Structure formats: structure tokens, C-alpha cells
Amino acid sequence: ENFQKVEKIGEGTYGVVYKARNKLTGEVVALKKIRLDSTAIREISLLKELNHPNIVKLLDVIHTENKLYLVFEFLHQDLKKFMDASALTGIPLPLIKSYLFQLLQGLAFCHSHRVLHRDLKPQNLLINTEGAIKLADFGLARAEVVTLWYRAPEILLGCKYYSTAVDIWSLGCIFAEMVTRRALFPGDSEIDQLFRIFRTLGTPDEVVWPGVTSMPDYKPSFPKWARQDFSKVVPPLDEDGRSLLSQMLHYDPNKRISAKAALAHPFFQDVTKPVPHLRL
Amino acid sequence: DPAWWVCAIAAIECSDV
Ligand SMILES: *CC(=O)Nc1ccc(NC(=O)C*)cc1
Ligand SMILES: [N]
């Protein structure tokens, strides 16, 4: 039967995204087809078990021959395209606050289950018309240039243990990008990424980050830059928002604020759930 | 019974040539 309607939605990176509608019932699901060349299925399938309103509902993971079909709820847009559409006006700060609040909710849930995203970027965050935003694309990498701008420094320095703090770093970068309408650290290589971080937050030392000089890719020949004023880096963000961001961007992953602790930050205490200012 | 979208995957597989 040709009782459904399947249509290409676009994109690249990992795969092609499709929109399927059930004509008789009206039901709609999204599909992502991604080619291969079993560790991926294990990590991708765990998201069927993680049910949270700020995590995309993964309906199934289907391994057929040399392809992988991901079936999930159909959300209308991703945060990167919404940021582009909002570039002229900016996203209203109540909406930025709500989105950040909701994303910290989803990461708190993930991190309480000792589940990490590890590859957070705006392209992985989906929004609907009712004001919700959801984490998506867990584990897809298991099946680098694009992900670089949001990578925590301990990863760039070759650390082998990824804590939950790597997701908080990435979200901090997305927070700054929503506020300023420009990526915070747009590196074109691993070393350019590190140096862009160093020039803004100061070149890290053993005082601010115990153990940093013993990481695999640390080099004493790193140039020594001084810390910059956050009021210059994310204007015109308010003092509360700046306090939160700086705790999200501590160098030492143990000092970086947790998702739970961040939810209690004074920045969030007038948070609401407004609908998107655009037709998104 | 399987979900309705089993046919949608069948259709994409068919038209991926
Ligand atoms: C349930 C259903 O409709 N499956 C199905 C099978 C085959 C095709 N098309 C081709 O094989 C070309 C569509 C749907
Ligand atoms: N094809």
C-alpha cells in the first residue's frame, strides 16, 4: 500500500532525515538513515530507555544489512537553524533562559544515569512550536570537525576520562552563542581550539587546574595569555548570567558546575516557558 | 502487529538505489 507519505527532509553529517506521515491516522514520525562500513547500536539504543521531556523520544533503532534507521518523534526544527533565523533580532532572553533551563534539566537526568552525550552542539538540539527543546543524537558518532567548537579543554588535551563536566562545557558554549549570535570558540584545529580558549579564559596552569601540566597533549611551550573580562566576551549578558556561564566554563572539570547545581542558580529564578518568538 | 512506519523504512530501502 502507498498509504503513507515519506519525504526527504535534508541534512548531511551522519545521515539523511525523513518525515513519514500515516495518511489514514495522520501520525508523523521522523527517520534518520545512516550508513555503516555493533558498538554503535548498543550506545544508540540506550536512549530508548531514557524517557525525559527534554530528551528526544527514540522509538526504535533498526540495523538492516549495512544501514541504520533511527525512528523518533518529529520535531520541527533544530537550534542551529533557529539561531540563524534569529541572527538579525537575537533570541529573546526569556527564551534563551528557558532553553538553557530545559537543557540543564535533560542533562541532569542523563548524568544521574551516568549517561553522557559527549558531542553536544546546536545541531543536536530540537525545538517544537510549544516552547520545548530536547537533546538528540546520543551515540551517533560511534557509528569531529563540526563538533570541535564545543569540546571541553580536557578532551583537547588528550584526557582519557570524560566526566559529566564535558557536557556542561559544551552547553556553556551554546549559552554564549545564543546570547552573542556568534560561536564562542570557533577553532579550525585542535590546537587552534585550545588557543582560542586560552586567549579568552587565560592559559591554564597548575594553580587553576591541578594536574593540567601532566595531561597527554599539554606542552609547556603553550603561549601564556591572561584571562579576559567576561563582560567583554558575552555582552550584554546580565551579571547573573555571566556568573553562571563562568562556572560552566571552569577549566578544572571537578570545579565546573553540575547540571543540578546550575538549575538552582539565581539566573533562573524568573524563568518561564515562552513559545518561540518566530514561527519555528 | 508492527508499527505503521515499518512500511516507511521498506519504502526508503526500496528507493535507495
Ligand atoms: C507495509 C508496507 O507497505 N511495506 C512496503 C513494502 C514495499 C514498498 N515498496 C517497494 O518495495 C518498492 C513499500 C512499502
Ligand atoms: N542508488
**Dihedral class, residue A158 (left if φ above 0, else alpha if ψ from -120 to 50, else beta):** left
Is A31 within 8 Å of B5 when comparing Cβ atoms?
A: yes
Q: How far apart are CA A213 and CA A229, in angstroms?
A: 24
Residues A224 and A91 in one domain: yes
CA B13, A50, A175, A249 dihedral sign is negative
Residue B16, ligand 2, Cβ within 6 A: yes
What range defines the domain where residue A62 resides? 4-72
Residues of A designated catalytic: 119
On whether the CB atoms of residues A245 and A171 are closer than 8 A, the answer is no
Resolution (A): 2.1
On whether the CB atoms of residues A193 and A200 are closer than 8 A, the answer is no
* A64 bridge partner residues: A67
Is B4 within 8 Å of A25 when comparing Cβ atoms?
A: yes
Known binding residue A74? Answer is yes
Residues A136 and A254 in one domain: yes
CA A203, A205, A208, A209 dihedral sign is positive
| Determination technique for this entry | X-ray
Question: How far are the Cα atoms of A20, A28, B17 from residue A23, in angstroms, in the given order?
Answer: 9, 9, 25
> How many domains in chain A?
2
> Between B8, B13, B16, which is nearest A20 by CB?
B8
Number of other CB atoms surrounding residue A91 within 10 Å: 22
Q: How many CB pairs under 8 A join A and B?
A: 39
Residues A229 and A251 in one domain: yes
Which chain B residues are Cβ-neighbours of A34 within 8 angstroms?
A: none
Task: Measure CA A86 to chain center.
Answer: 18
Strand order in the sheet with A16-22: A4-10, A16-22, A28-35, A67-72, A58-64
Q: How far apart are CA A207 and CA A212, in angstroms?
A: 9
Q: How far apart are CA A94 and CA A103, in angstroms?
A: 14
Is A4 within 8 Å of B12 when comparing Cβ atoms?
A: no
Closest atom, ligand 1, to C-alpha of A4: 3
Ligand nearest to the CA of A6: 1
Residues A65 and A148 in one domain: no
Residue A277 domain flag: no
On whether the CB atoms of residues A110 and A167 are closer than 8 A, the answer is yes
The CATH number covering residue A113 comes to: 1.10.510.10
Q: How far apart are CA A168 and CA A176, in angstroms?
A: 12
